[PDB]
Amino acid sequence: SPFHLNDAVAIVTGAAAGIGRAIAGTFAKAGASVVVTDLKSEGAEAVAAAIRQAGGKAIGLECNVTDEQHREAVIKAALDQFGKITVLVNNAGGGGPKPFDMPMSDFEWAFKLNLFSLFRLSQLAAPHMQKAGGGAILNISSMAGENTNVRMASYGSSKAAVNHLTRNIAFDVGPMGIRVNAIAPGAIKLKHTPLGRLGEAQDIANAALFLCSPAAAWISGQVLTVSGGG
Amino acid sequence: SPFHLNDAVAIVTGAAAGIGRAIAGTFAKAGASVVVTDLKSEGAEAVAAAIRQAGGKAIGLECNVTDEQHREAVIKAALDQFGKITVLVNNAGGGGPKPFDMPMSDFEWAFKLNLFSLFRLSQLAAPHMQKAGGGAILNISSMAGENTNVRMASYGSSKAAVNHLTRNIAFDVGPMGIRVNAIAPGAIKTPEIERAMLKHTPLGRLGEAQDIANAALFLCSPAAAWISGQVLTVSGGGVQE
């Protein structure tokens, strides 16, 4: 009941497949109007169309989240179509194991893709959420942001930066009625996975729905790890 | 629809008032049969009666969670009343600011009340949860478990032990189909001192018991079927000291 998104307008990035795909469709089924975005325009349009055939409201848009014009086009299309913005899910991102001596452009790209993009989209969405009376921002981070390992210089540090960004900008945007959280997903489809199975995208999507819903109205600044206990 | 507790049996301790009461009432509305327990039996029974007259299923019992006989009795009564145990909310606890030179009985008691009790209750509940096809344990901790402050020797360190227990036993009972998480509440409203706590609370209001209950329902529900070993802090974005 407070776990619903009635009258919500949710922007979702990286939503052609996987976690972002499940978040888009789950948010629609919970009552949100969904602006489905992806690097691949065709994949975003497919998920948007699939959402419309199931009874929800959605449009599909191409968005390279590291492209300032793509970002602004997403913002405008949300407003032109649905009139406001109350939910932003920064799911687009990536990277992985790299050697310590990787080229600097690789190190710097992890931060542009995983951190600079979202921070900017949060900047763009925040005033509009404030005018709508409040909002929730959800960043999809990674377990490497809290873990320590080889080959994690760019991936672990940039996702760490996403985590502490979440914690800090909650102070900045709380007074505007905006909550900011993050989910750290485990591996999604075992000897160090207590619950004994891999994750499902729906698992991340359910946690996302809670954190973006009025059921989490007083939850901000949090990094929730969804990883079967490992 | 994943957020319901259909065919659940939840034991909730310290549930005559505040956070435990809100958890028990919320869990019943979501479909769980609730065993309401509290150090004060008539307070537990009153909460169970209100759940029944609102259309849910519940019984109320006395339980001092520091008493091993009480602990076994609550386990027995849950099975005698509803046939199984699938959810355990360790909400009973206490303590607060204490001087560094406190009597050792006060220091130890913080661990007896906040930690030993909920660990023992977890032990007693786990085999039954496994026979029932899986379950969730929920520990109500405190932000003092991560914060560092003056006069927190017993309270701060015992609640930190709760946080790390949660994280560690998640590994032990995961293979039995049992999730274990914790909620660390901030200032939950169960004039100048109010203005001070809001000054470091970004969301601009104090906590409500239903805020904790909502996050408890999520974490004990199928919507959190793959969440274990987490300490979710419910604080309005900040700290309150």
Ligand SMILES: NC(=O)c1ccc[n+]([C@@H]2O[C@H](COP(=O)([O-])OP(=O)(O)OC[C@H]3O[C@@H](n4cnc5c(N)ncnc54)[C@H](O)[C@@H]3O)[C@@H](O)[C@H]2O)c1
């Ligand atoms: N098991 C996991 O998948 C896993 C584990 C840890 C962390 N994560 C994080 O969760 C998020 C989910 O991503 P993923 O791993 O599923 O990625 P992915 O590459 O599997 O695909 C996700 C989608 O995002 C889109 N995308 C990629 N780059 C983009 C960009 N610059 N702008 C817009 N869209 C873009 C892709 O086209 C794709 O459809 C990522 O931020 C990732 O870092 C995922």
Ligand SMILES: NC(=O)c1ccc[n+]([C@@H]2O[C@H](COP(=O)([O-])OP(=O)(O)OC[C@H]3O[C@@H](n4cnc5c(N)ncnc54)[C@H](O)[C@@H]3O)[C@@H](O)[C@H]2O)c1
């Ligand atoms: N601001 C907050 O409310 C806050 C902040 C941090 C942590 N917590 C934690 O949340 C939990 C909820 O407590 P609350 O703050 O709602 O207090 P509360 O006094 O409102 O309710 C606690 C209940 O637990 C019962 N109780 C006390 N000792 C017991 C024992 N030994 N055995 C069984 N029952 C017992 C009491 O009778 C009472 O009904 C506590 O463990 C507390 O440490 C609360």
